[PDB]
Amino acid sequence: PEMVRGQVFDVGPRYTNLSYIGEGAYGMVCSAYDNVNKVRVAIKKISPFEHQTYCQRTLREIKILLRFRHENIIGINDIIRAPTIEQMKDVYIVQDLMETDLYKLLKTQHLSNDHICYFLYQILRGLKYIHSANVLHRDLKPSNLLLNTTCDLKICDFGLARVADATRWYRAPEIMLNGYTKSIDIWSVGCILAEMLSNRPIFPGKHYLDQLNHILGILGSPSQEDLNCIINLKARNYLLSLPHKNKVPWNRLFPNADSKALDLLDKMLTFNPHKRIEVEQALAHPYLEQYYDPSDEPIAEAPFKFDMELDDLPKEKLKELIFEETARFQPGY
Ligand SMILES: Nc1ncnc2c1ncn2[C@@H]1O[C@H](COP(=O)(O)OP(N)(=O)O)[C@@H](O)[C@H]1O
Ligand SMILES: *[C@@H]1[C@H](C(=O)OC(C)(C)C)C(=O)CC[C@@]1(C)C(=O)OC
Numbered sequence: 192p193e194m195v196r197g198q199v200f201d202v203g204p205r206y207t208n209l210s211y212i213g214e215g216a217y218g219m220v221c222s223a224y225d226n227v228n229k230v231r232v233a234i235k236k237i238s239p240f241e242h243q244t245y246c247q248r249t250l251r252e253i254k255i256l257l258r259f260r261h262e263n264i265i266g267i268n269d270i271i272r273a274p275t276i277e278q279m280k281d282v283y284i285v286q287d288l289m290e291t292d293l294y295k296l297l298k299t300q301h302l303s304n305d306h307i308c309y310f311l312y313q314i315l316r317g318l319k320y321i322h323s324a325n326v327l328h329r330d331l332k333p334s335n336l337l338l339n340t341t342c343d344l345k346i347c348d349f350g351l352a353r354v355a356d357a358t359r360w361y362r363a364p365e366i367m368l369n370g371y372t373k374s375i376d377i378w379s380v381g382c383i384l385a386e387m388l389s390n391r392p393i394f395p396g397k398h399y400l401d402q403l404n405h406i407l408g409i410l411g412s413p414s415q416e417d418l419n420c421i422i423n424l425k426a427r428n429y430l431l432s433l434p435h436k437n438k439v440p441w442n443r444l445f446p447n448a449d450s451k452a453l454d455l456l457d458k459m460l461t462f463n464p465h466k467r468i469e470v471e472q473a474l475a476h477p478y479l480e481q482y483y484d485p486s487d488e489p490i491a492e493a494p495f496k497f498d499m500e501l502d503d504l505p506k507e508k509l510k511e512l513i514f515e516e517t518a519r520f521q522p523g524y
Pocket of ligand 1: 212213214215216218220233235265286287288289290291292334337347348
């Protein structure tokens with residue numbers, strides 16, 4: 192078995208020449224060469240079966256990415272795991288090899304207005320397809336926006352995605368106030384647009400309540416109509432207890448930015464999720480006029496459905512489901 196930084200990476204003989212890329216709390220990512228298709232790939236090693244929540248993420252990501260097919264969404268090429276469920280401790284997810292992500296890019300480069308518009312369009316184009324399948328991504332952030340050798344952008348990491356019915360900096364305020372809609376993703380995109388405009392996260396809270404104070408320190412205290420739409424009465428009461436804060440005009444934060452970008456940013460970062468701009472309206476915003484093309488922005492064929500609920504299933508049941516979902520990559524299915 193091939194090894195990388197002391198970790199077993201049992202993906203041969205099809206996949207060889209592994210090179211470390213990075214890792215997470217329970218998964219290492221490497222680049223590799225696919226000797227069968229003669230292409231470079233990324234391979235994520237996932238070891239989730241001791242933790243029910245990690246099993247949930249793994250199954251959600253697999254089920255959703257295997258059903259989605261869109262130029263602005265990462266695909267799954269192949270999945271490697273053991274031939275028997277008792278032997279399966281790791282899952283390897285093979286994907287097209289990307290060059291970088293927006294998080295890394297923003298660390299070293301200040302984006303021109305042209306760059307920002309181009310990246311925002313692709314995010315929203317990918318997001319339109321996602322929402323057209325009635326799916327909420329729920330964890331959009333710069334590190335989940337990958338770029339390939341030709342500067343095409345692909346949304347990845349659907350482990351927290353849900354059918355509509357790590358870092359807190361990009362989470363909508365209603366999440367931290369306890370019915371989540373497609374607007375929670377629009378908020379995240381607004382946070383990403385703000386960060387492309389300044390190479391600075393706009394709401395970098397050090398914890399839960401500090402995050403809310405950052406949001407209110409820019410947007411100002413919520414209006415009565417905004418407060419009226421907070422269903423959680425206790426969160427509404429806590430908001431009422433806070434000292435008043437005035438709205439900070441967007442052009443004081445970003446004095447050099449395109450005024451059309453600020454108008455769109457304002458419509459994405461509205462406190463009330465019901466007044467937040469939707470993805471189709473965002474694509475049609477004058478800021479994106481040079482790219483908007485509904486004849487080249489495809490949508491899903493039908494809304495996605497998990498056919499079941501995963502939140503309360505034991506990890507042993509989730510492992511059986513991951514085994515069944517990955518059988519199609521085995522010789523025998
Ligand atoms: N398909 C891919 N191609 C190239 N690099 C990739 C990739 N999928 C993930 N990566 C990279 O692997 C590293 C960790 O990815 P990931 O498994 O998603 O960790 P995390 N905790 O950010 O969610 C990151 O540096 C990421 O950019
Ligand atoms: C792509 C570009 C980029 O990083 O491309 C590589 C190096 C292939 C990842 C950017 O930094 C933003 C600009 C751009 C969209 C672009 O096309 O101009 C280079």
